[PDB]
Amino acid sequence: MKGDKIVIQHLNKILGNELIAINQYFLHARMYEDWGLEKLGKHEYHESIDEMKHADKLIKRILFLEGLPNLQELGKLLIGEHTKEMLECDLKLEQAGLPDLKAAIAYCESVGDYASRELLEDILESEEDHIDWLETQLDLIDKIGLENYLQSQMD
């Protein structure tokens, strides 16, 4: 079914943001794994597998709405050379992306593409959870110390 062009452009933009997350979180996940921070590694890993599920959902919707997914563009990954920075970089990434989600939800309501809106609402919820988890880690580092925080991420 021919969907709304602008909706598809919005959907293709969010898709591109998830691609960034996918790659970034997977790299950080292995960087933790490689450092002995197994706990952190697993969480970063699962976050990665979720962005993959998110991208997948958008891909399917874009295809249904008869448009062509953009799996070609890859944005600026924000890596990070150590835990505190990697946490920040990930939070940063999750935030620069919230505005897009909300704008597109707003646009979907205006044109009456409610089904695409529901899809975006769900993705939005997951993003607010990951941000909650990130702010939490960062705060924890402040309360117990980096050495303590890292010690507790080993197993």
Decide whether 49 or 144 has the Cβ nearer to ligand HEM: 49
Decide whether 26 or 133 has the Cβ nearer to ligand HEM: 26
In the structure encoding, which two tokens stand for residue 90, read together?
Answer: 């990930």
CA nearest 81: which of 138, 27, 143? 27
Task: Give the residue ranges of the annotated binding site for Fe cation.
Answer: 18, 51, 54, 94, 127, 130
Decide whether 6 or 77 has the Cβ nearer to a second copy: 77
**Torsion angle of C-alpha atoms 18, 22, 24, 29, degrees rounded to 10:** 150
SS3 of 150, please? helix
Site string for ligand HEM, 23-62 (x = CB under 6 A): x--x----------------------x--xx-xx--x---
Nearest approach in angstroms of CB 62 to Mg ion is 11
AA identity, residue 80: G
Partner whose footprint covers residue 124, from Fe ion, Mg ion, a second copy, none (CB < 5 to 8 Å by kind): a second copy
The torsion region of residue 5 among left (phi > 0), alpha (psi -120 to 50) and beta comes to: alpha
Binding of a second copy by 85 (CB under 8 A) = no
Nearest approach in angstroms of CB 90 to Fe ion is 8
CA distances from 131 to 18, 75, 127, 153 (A): 14, 20, 6, 19
Binding site for Ba ion (CB under 5 A): 148
